[PDB]
Every structure is written in structure tokens, then in C-alpha cells.
Design a protein around this ligand. Structure first.
Ligand SMILES: Nc1ncnc2c1ncn2[C@@H]1O[C@H](CSCC[C@H](N)C(=O)O)[C@@H](O)[C@H]1O
Length: 213
């Protein structure tokens, strides 16, 4: 429900997260690595948004992608992941609201998010009609993602939201990216969106984006 929007809920959830098992929303790395890894390079500077206590950041490292930075607005979970992953100095963790990324522009080659925009859109009354706040907060995040990516960078989003709900959010021309989609995971009911800066949206995608902005 809408309680997933508030940091207090997450700070409460993540007490003791350094000692508890990792937890992954909408699949772990195994469920989508066939889709994800061909889009990555070992030298890529990767930013993971709303990391929580997911094993994704660690799995990227074990898979040959050491340049990982992970952020979350729960300072509790950031401290916990710093402690849990103290054996992996390559991995960086910082407390941050993803609506304002405190990095200089063009600092990353890839940005990933799994279940974070879902938190921003949690509890919407009508899945077909996005509230003013839902539109604005998601647009803020996406603008920041585009800003911190280098030219030519990639943003990859993993969510339970199917394209007839989520494409309208990603299909804004000013983000400066193309948009592709694949399904994965449980009953092929999870959705992976690939955005490549320098590409263009289709007229279909732009028409959906025009529905909210
Ligand atoms: N505005 C915001 N800024 C930064 N983190 C946010 C945020 N809104 C929600 N979050 C974080 O987003 C996460 C949503 S749950 C997804 C967790 C993790 N990426 C996984 O794949 O399992 C939580 O860890 C929550 O604290």
C-alpha cells in the first residue's frame, strides 16, 4: 500500500538487515541476468537506485562488474549494507533520495533500479490514472537518471508494472533515450525496461508519454 512511499517504513523494515538474509523484490539476479549482462561491460560505472538489502549489487561484483555504487533513502539500510559488504571495498553505498542524485552530471555508464519506482507509485488509487505527485516524483527520478548518465549511457528498470502502465513514464523525449522491453521471472510476469541514451522513442511510446506530461 501507500505506506511503501515513506522512509519511516523502510527504516523500520531494515533494522537488523546486516545480519538477516538478503531480500530481492521482483526476482533476484538469476531471474534476469540473461537479459541484463549482455547490456553491461566489465568497466561500466554502475549506479543502483533504492538498493535496499538486495543481493543485486554483490551479484554484479561476483559476476565481473566491480564498479557498483548503491543508494537508498533508508540510512539504516545503507549502514547495514556498508557493514554486510565490508569485505567488498569496490562496492560503494550512500544515503540518498533518488529524486535528487548528489553526483555530478555524466558520472555513470549504467543506472539500474528494481522495485524503486514501484515504491514511488505505491498505493495509487487508480492504476490507469496517475496522481499528480506520482507523475512528478517519477519524472524527477528519471530526469536525474538521464542527467547522471554519460552520453550513450543505459538505464535498466525492473518492475511488476506492465508496459500499458509503465511506458508512459519512461517515454518522455527530453530524457534522450530509446525504450525496449522484455519479460522475465515469476510466470514471465516481471518486466525489464532498457533505455539507451542517444536513441529515440517510437510514435506509439511518445503518445503514451503525452498522456501524463
Ligand atoms: N525516494 C527514494 N529515494 C531513495 N530510495 C527510495 C526512495 N523511495 C523508496 N526507496 C527505497 O526503494 C526500495 C524499494 S524495495 C526494492 C529494493 C531493492 N532494489 C530490491 O530489488 O529488492 C527500498 O529499499 C526503499 O527504501
Amino acid at each position: 500500500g501507500s505506506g511503501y512511499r515513506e522512509v519511516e517504513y523502510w527504516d523500520q523494515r531494515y533494522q537488523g538487515a546486516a545480519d538477516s538474509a538478503p531480500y530481492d523484490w521482483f526476482g533476484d539476479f538469476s531471474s534476469f541476468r540473461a537479459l541484463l549482462e549482455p547490456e553491461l561491460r566489465p568497466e561500466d560505472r554502475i549506479l543502483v537506485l533504492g538498493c535496499g538489502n538486495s543481493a543485486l549489487s554483490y551479484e554484479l561484483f561476483l559476476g565481473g562488474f566491480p564498479n557498483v555504487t548503491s543508494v537508498d533513502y533508508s540510512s539504516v539500510v545503507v549502514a547495514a549494507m556498508q557493514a554486510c559488504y565490508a569485505h567488498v571495498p569496490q562496492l560503494r553505498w550512500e544515503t540518498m533520495d533518488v529524486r535528487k542524485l548528489d553526483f555530478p552530471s555524466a558520472s555513470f555508464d549504467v543506472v539500474l533500479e528494481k522495485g524503486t519506482l514501484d515504491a514511488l507509485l505505491a498505493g495509487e488509487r487508480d492504476p490507469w490514472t496517475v496522481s499528480s505527485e506520482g507523475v512528478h516524483t517519477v519524472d524527477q527520478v528519471l530526469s536525474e537518471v538521464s542527467r547522471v548518465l554519460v552520453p550513450g549511457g543505459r538505464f535498466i528498470s525492473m518492475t511488476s508494472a506492465a508496459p500499458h502502465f509503465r511506458t508512459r513514464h519512461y517515454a518522455q523525449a527530453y530524457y534522450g533515450w530509446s525504450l525496449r522491453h522484455a519479460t522475465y521471472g515469476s510466470g514471465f510476469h516481471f518486466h525489464l525496461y532498457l533505455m539507451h541514451k542517444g536513441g529515440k522513442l517510437s510514435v506509439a511510446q511518445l503518445a503514451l508519454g503525452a498522456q501524463i506530461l
